[PDB]
Nucleic acid binder design. Structure first.
Lengths: 493, 530
DNA sequence: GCCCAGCTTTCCCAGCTAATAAACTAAAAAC
DNA sequence: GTTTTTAGTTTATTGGGC
């Protein structure tokens, strides 16, 4: 039930060389990217196990005493101290702390390195699912000068693949470029391009820090006989402030909580079949059994029932009701599902049509109409999948979810006023990215926990990225504001 | 705030003409009225409702003086609806053997509103007529009728057996009794109804004439008595020197059940007889209880457990200035994809009410963004307590009004970058040419739209956003059933409900052959391994 | 701080209703 | 079976000028 991710970092000489730029060294980039995954995994209460290994170091630390391999952090749940530890190698001062604590630029043999990593998976007392190793290096030919090592590394790499361990390569920039065909083509389990900016390394790593996890596997019925299986995923989910937990003052140990129900008179425990459900209207009571309150909610069996196809232009942008889901074929339940799915996708795209369906997530839930909107795959310049291929499950509001509002005369602005506003709009133009803002509230909450768990001098204060940069904006706008006002607001306002 | 409504029902002889398998107008109208009264009862509004019947055998109304307005009965006088009204509708009220003047029924209906709304303050007075326009009637009171409706601010709606604009399915999507199948008397009555509605509403008056069938799958019967939304005052700020007074209303907001089920004792059927006591024990083995005077608050930080009291959390807690709607910047609309929409609402933002300066200012913004194909990225915070949100405000320009539509955008911590295998470049699941053509034929047969009335316009044949959430009227049918028949188990779902949740019978029929070809072209079988 | 605002099957003396979102509890299904 | 997710509750905190 717990996936495993080992972060493996190259400590060779070139990992600490920026290559003359206003950019971080591949090593700093790597450390910072690893901290990120550690922290995000905490923000979302992820139960995966993380590990941190370095190789090419002068100092070694592993159960078999293989040389130049340092297991900084064995596989375990992330915490405050482990994160704080990684921060010690951040930046230029970090570089100095790492090199003085472990040394760098020493020799090594990838085979020995991969053996140590595989062994960390075996030492896990917990049961595991996915076993993955993420390698960070800007060296594309480790043993191009030592066949005895190159050969052992390929064999071990192959043994990993046969053994169920996945090795992903997070290749970093190198003069002339990083050539995967030279060596790693036969090791890793179109590929991402090399990373040269933290941003890119982060997304590529984020794209793999967590494995797919369906919100539900359902049947998509074209009719009663033609049924395919699909996975429903939430590519977006509102990260909430983790709920509190009750502890025992004298030991800070978590406490279990049992909620029972008893007759007030006798004090006897009340079975679920010893109580009924009531609703009072006016001066009349209507009694139903628990079983019946659920039954009146029953309509369709869980699934997606195809209603037909509706042209996309008929679906309004302003009818949003709640976050959309993502639909992808689940070949593991119904063999043949992907082919039909792909066809539906290809054709819905050509005809700019959506598949209308009646949706029921689980048993005993009234249905909601949804529009499966065709979504074509999209990769950016780094070869990162920005948009996964499939269908956007768009929830449609029932008439009850719509609200009316009275409108007075339509008052429109003149070309001269719109022009002034246009000029203002163009001044405060910027490039929006779905991941540019952080949640002020969540961030502060964990900064606070950090200060308490690590006994820091003070709680770091989060930077509210949602607040407008007022002063900057004012200067950037100049007199456009006063101008706009003269065209719109009577001095007597 | 409150409304006075008179349901004017036709229970005349013709209302019972049963068509071999097709429900009579009387029974259809009876379902629509029950639908309306049920919602008014279970939602516990303050609207007052009267019920006038015409075509009845007897005569009982405050205008019969002088052998006039005969066969018109005021079954229920203006007052809060109750279970006795619903029961009468369902069981007592029987079809009549006569025929009454429908404009006379309207006049009696107007009388009820005029003589009984006395003193009480009603924001709205409304009359709903349910008839088949089968019989003769006088047209001498037309001007009198219209003059009183307008002067007394009384709105009107009509409900007939046929639409105004094959196997019959009540509440379905598709039938249209041709205006030719109706009698000549009905064509005359319909013209008058049209004239009346046009005088009262204008061009759109035609829109207030419905078929009983379509009424069952709409909220139109409540349309003129719907609770108007509350406005939210605030200033849209650009920098710190430009403020614009605005008012926001929620356009989309999921409707939920209001009444909760109270757990009670199966014998006393009372709530006080039940009580819940939540105790605490050491989760680890040796389940030892603990007293409330020994438990503190804490949080998890990965594997760490961190005690953090609500008092300390209260002060270190992130705190904002408060209410706001601040622009952070503007960007191409293309950089904002709908698949990233967040939250559980949509907000329409208008200039503050009656503020022309604010309106012109906002209109400037709207049109500039529209003319630049851009949108605003803003910080929205309901109040000083609410967690602040980042969101998009995009231009919404119509002919009757203009505004910005607000929808929340996601925070980085809300995203999940799950990678998915490519399907276009699939070396396993690429469909053959025949499979693609079968799907292509399936999509055409199952089209839910049509370029009808030849105007290059797309007519939606299955507009789901007009259909009411089925759980409500289903719940009401049950709540009522349990009230009028305590010993009986719950009734099954009404067919008209199922009929409105399904596509036009036309669509279903066309797809059969195409579906058959797809079943043979696309093998599908459940996995036995893994 | 201090209370606004109105309408009446509670009554006009007064009462009390309201809007809504952050929190929280419970049940289903994924793993 | 345990963990994430959600519908169903719950109850208080909230606005704004003077």
């Amino acid at each position: 039930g717990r996936d495993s991710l080992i972060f493996l970092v190259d400590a060779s000489k070139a990992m600490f060389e920026s290559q003359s730029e206003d950019e971080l060294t591949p090593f700093d980039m790597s450390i910072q990217c690893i901290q990120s995954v550690y922290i995000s995994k905490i923000i979302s209460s992820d139960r995966d196990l993380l590990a941190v290994v370095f190789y090419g170091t002068e100092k070694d630390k592993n159960s078999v005493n293989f040389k130049n391999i340092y297991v900084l952090q064995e596989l375990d749940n992330p915490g405050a101290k482990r994160i704080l530890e990684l921060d010690q190698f951040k930046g230029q001062q970090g570089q100095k702390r790492f090199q003085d604590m472990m040394g760098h630029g020493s020799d090594y043999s990838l085979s020995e390195v991969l053996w140590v990593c595989a062994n960390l998976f075996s030492d896990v007392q917990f049961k595991m699912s996915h076993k993955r190793i993420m390698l960070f290096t800007n060296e594309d030919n480790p043993h191009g000068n030592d066949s005895a090592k190159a050969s052992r590394a390929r064999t071990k790499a192959g043994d990993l693949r046969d053994t169920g361990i996945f090795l992903d390569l997070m290749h970093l920039k190198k003069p002339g470029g990083f050539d995967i065909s030279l060596f790693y083509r036969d090791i890793i389990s179109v590929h991402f391009e090399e990373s040269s900016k933290l941003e890119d390394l982060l997304r590529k790593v984020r794209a793999k820090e967590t494995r797919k996890r369906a919100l539900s596997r359902l049947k998509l019925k074209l009719n009663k006989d033609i049924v395919i299986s699909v996975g429903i995923y939430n590519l977006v989910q509102k990260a909430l402030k983790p709920p509190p937990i009750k502890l025992y003052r004298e030991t800070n140990e978590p406490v279990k909580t049992k909620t029972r129900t008893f007759n007030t008179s006798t004090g006897g425990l009340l079975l679920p079949s010893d109580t009924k459900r009531s609703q009072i209207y006016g001066s009349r009571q209507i009694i139903l059994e628990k079983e019946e309150t659920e039954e009146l909610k029953r309509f369709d069996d869980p699934g997606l029932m195809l209603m037909g196809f509706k042209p996309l232009v008929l679906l309004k942008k302003h009818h949003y009701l709640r976050p959309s889901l993502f639909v992808y074929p689940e070949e593991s339940l119904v063999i043949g599902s992907s082919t039909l799915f792909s066809a539906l996708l290809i054709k819905c795209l050509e005809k700019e049509v959506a598949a209308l369906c009646r949706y029921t997530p689980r048993r005993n839930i009234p249905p909601y109409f949804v529009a499966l909107v065709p979504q074509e795959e999209e990769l950016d310049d780094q070869k990162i999948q920005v948009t996964p291929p499939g269908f956007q499950l768009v929830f449609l509001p029932f008439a009850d979810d719509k609200r009316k509002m009275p409108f007075t005369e339509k008052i429109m602005a003149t070309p001269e006023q719109v022009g002034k506003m246009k000029a203002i709009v163009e001044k405060l133009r910027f490039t929006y990215r779905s991941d540019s803002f952080e949640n002020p509230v969540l961030q502060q909450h964990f900064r606070n926990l950090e200060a308490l768990a690590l006994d820091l001098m003070e709680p770091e204060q989060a930077v509210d990225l949602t607040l407008p940069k007022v002063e900057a904006m004012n200067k950037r706008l100049g007199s456009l504001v006063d101008e706009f006002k003269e065209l719109v607001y009577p001095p007597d306002y | 705030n409150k409304a006075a409504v008179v349901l004017c029902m036709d229970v005349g002889f013709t209302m019972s003409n049963s068509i071999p398998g097709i429900e009579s107008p009387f029974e259809q109208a009876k379902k629509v009225i029950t639908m309306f009264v049920q919602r008014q009862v279970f939602a516990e509004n303050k609207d007052e409702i009267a019920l006038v019947l015409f075509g009845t055998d007897g005569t009982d109304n405050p205008l019969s003086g002088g052998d006039q307005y005969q066969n018109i009965t005021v079954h229920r006088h203006l007052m809060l609806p109750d279970f006795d009204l619903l029961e009468d509708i369902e069981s007592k009220i029987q079809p009549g053997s006569q025929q009454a003047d429908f404009l006379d029924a309207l006049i009696v209906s107007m009388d009820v509103i005029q003589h009984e709304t006395i003193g009480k303050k009603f924001e709205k007075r409304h009359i709903e007529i349910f008839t088949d326009l089968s019989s003769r009637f006088s047209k001498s009171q037309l001007d009198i009728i219209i003059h009183s409706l307008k002067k007394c601010d009384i709105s009107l709606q009509f409900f007939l057996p046929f639409s105004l604009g094959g196997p019959f399915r009540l509440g379905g999507h598709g039938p249209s009794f041709p205006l030719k199948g109706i009698t000549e008397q009905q064509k005359e009555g319909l013209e008058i109804v049209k004239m009346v509605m046009i005088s009262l509403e204008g061009e759109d008056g035609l829109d207030e004439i419905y078929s009983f069938s379509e009424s069952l799958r709409k909220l139109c019967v409540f349309k003129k008595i719907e609770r108007h939304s509350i406005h939210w005052p605030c200033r849209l700020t650009i920098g710190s020197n430009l403020s614009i007074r605005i008012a926001a209303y929620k356009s989309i907001l999921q409707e939920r059940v209001k009444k909760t089920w109270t757990v009670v004792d199966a014998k006393t059927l009372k709530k006080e007889d039940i009580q819940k006591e939540t105790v605490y024990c050491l989760n680890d083995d040796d389940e030892t209880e603990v007293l409330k005077e020994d438990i503190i608050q804490g949080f998890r930080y990965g594997s760490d457990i961190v005690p953090f009291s609500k008092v300390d959390e209260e002060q270190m807690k992130y705190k904002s200035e408060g209410k706001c709607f601040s622009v952070l910047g503007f960007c191409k609309s293309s950089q904002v994809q709908r698949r990233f929409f967040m939250g559980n609402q949509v907000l329409k933002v208008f200039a503050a009410r009656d503020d022309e300066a604010a309106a012109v200012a906002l209109s400037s913004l709207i049109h500039a963004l529209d003319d630049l194909d851009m949108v605003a990225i803003v910080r929205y915070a309901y109040d000083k307590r609410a967690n602040p949100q980042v969101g998009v405000a995009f231009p919404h320009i119509k002919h009757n009004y203009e505004c910005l539509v607000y929808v929340q955008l996601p925070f980085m911590e809300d995203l999940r970058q799950y990678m998915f295998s490519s399907l276009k470049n699939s070396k396993k699941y690429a469909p053959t040419e025949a499979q693609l053509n079968a799907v292509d034929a399936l999509i055409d047969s199952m089209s839910l739209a049509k370029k009808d009335e030849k105007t290059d316009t797309l007519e939606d044949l299955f507009p789901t956003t007009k259909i009411p959430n089925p759980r409500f009227q289903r719940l009401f049918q049950c709540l009522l059933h349990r009230a009028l028949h305590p010993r009986e188990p719950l009734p099954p779902i009404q067919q008209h409900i199922w009929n409105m949740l399904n596509p036009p019978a036309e669509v279903t029929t066309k797809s059969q052959i195409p579906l058959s070809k797809i079943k043979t072209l696309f093998p599908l079988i459940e996995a036995k391994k893994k």
